[PDB]
Design a protein around this ligand. Sequence first.
Ligand SMILES: [Zn+2]
Ligand SMILES: [Zn+2]
Lengths: 99, 97
Amino acid sequence: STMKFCRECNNILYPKEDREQSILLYACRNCDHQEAADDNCVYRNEVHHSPTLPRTKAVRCAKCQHGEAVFFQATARGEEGMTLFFVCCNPNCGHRWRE
Amino acid sequence: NGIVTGIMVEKGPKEALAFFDSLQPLLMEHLDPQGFSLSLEDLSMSREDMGVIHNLIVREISPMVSRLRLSYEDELQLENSIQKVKEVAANFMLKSY
Ligand SMILES: [Zn+2]
Ligand SMILES: [Zn+2]
């Protein structure tokens, strides 16, 4: 939602709809001035939000010789239902393998 | 500590105190013509062993603190790796009299 302003008073515009033509139009509240709208959105929020996954430490990896591979529940495109996969938290791993 | 307990079992407490009062000056006089002291060479670890232990801060501790960037609660794993380093560190400085 970008703010819009009046061309006579340069105050903030107030959206206001009369159902004579089924049309939205921005109106000013200062003098009397009105004009026709262009956009659609009356309000926009983008509310907010603009590891705690379980780890093991006793399994072989592919690249690094570590025990860790974090496992979370997934349902992949070639998988089925509940599946587990193992990629090490080391960035040397980079590889996702099935059991 | 086994022998003093056996003496206290067999002949009472007033023989255990006689054991202590006969043993302690017998020890403190045995230390008198030998002495015992420290040195600067005791606190000086050798240089190639210093190079060994410095090659473990950036081998299994810097790649572990690379995981500490996001992982929080592995502090006991942290201390496990740390004491794994500390034990082999303390292993060298017991090779002195
Ligand atoms: Zn106006
Ligand atoms: Zn790997």
